[PDB]
Amino acid sequence: LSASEALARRRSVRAFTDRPVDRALLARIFEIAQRAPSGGNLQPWQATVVTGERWQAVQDAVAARIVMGREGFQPEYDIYPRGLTDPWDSRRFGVGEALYASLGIARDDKAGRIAQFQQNYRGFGAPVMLFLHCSRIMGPPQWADMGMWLQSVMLLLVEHGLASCPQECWAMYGATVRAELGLGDDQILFSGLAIGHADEEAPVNRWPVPRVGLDEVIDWQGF
């Protein structure tokens, strides 16, 4: 599988089969993903990978927070910018529209879409959850470094016939997640990464995901 093909085939998978992930395979993928570049070769990314009973504990701990409602939230940071405007805000809901449409839940049906949302905290049934975190001394460019590493992993997973869904929803309960994992407060949780084998027949995995055109992204000067 070529780099181009891996990139095309990578999507956020929100339906996984009940099927284990070979840990030896995982380690080899992390080995190669470490070749991601970073400012000053700092390699600021740290990861805690969980499965089985530990993965079950994290889910339980967060579930206990979820039923507290808005009172239970523990945001690591502002997931979205507070002053978010168009064109960006609309991009969120365009993808949202497609996702829920691909399922069998109406637009107005606020009850059912909530239910599917909570599936996030089961990692959409993935056997493995990766938690990506770093020291709180790190600034924005090191967060960009983390992104380079995370995309490397996601691409490598696809090349090896695995799949993933990156999840910032975990940062909504950062302290609970950090406490459950045994991470100290010197660390900040950025994102989770659900990892497993895709259910390739699941409709939620088959809808075409949109992107803006290059005219909204790239300016050419001097050509």
Next chain:
Amino acid sequence: LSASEALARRRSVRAFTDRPVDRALLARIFEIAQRAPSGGNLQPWQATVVTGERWQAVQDAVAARIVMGREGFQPEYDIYPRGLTDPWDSRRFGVGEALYASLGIARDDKAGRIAQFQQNYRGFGAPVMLFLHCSRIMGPPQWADMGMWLQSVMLLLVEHGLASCPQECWAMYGATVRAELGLGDDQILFSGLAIGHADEEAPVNRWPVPRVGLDEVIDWQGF
């Protein structure tokens, strides 16, 4: 070239040939790179790509700042964390020594380190410079998004027989660069990316670049 191979063969290239870059190739690469994921599909990354006369104008404007010395600096942000410590600093010093050894530039050699500094602001002789920037409303997770896009770009270049060097050195003169590109102060410059055909005979492009072992990266729980 497989995704694994692309990741392994990508390095920060600091010597380029005069061979021109097919814009048609670049544009197709960007089309694919847009498939990078982002939190909420915000796709926050923006890029202004420059070549030819406009590219030299940017160099000229920044060069005007360099001769001002420490007064010429216009930091967009802290490139390295204030209060950086080990293990990360040690990682930096490792690649630094390696890079300078390949150039034949000594510790005492203040002349060469300055020249090497100045070479950064020529994009190391690359025919095309990409400037990655975003709205100033974006937060750290959106900077991670930019990182996912940028690594996507760097891998695709390598797949197509091209090469790159990510460059935060441009952020040192952000306002000069943004002013020259015609960017407003609503935008913040993250990084440059030099793009072109690598000079593979160049020793600076040939030394083995270090990475820490997975024992410093991944914690396994529940296996």
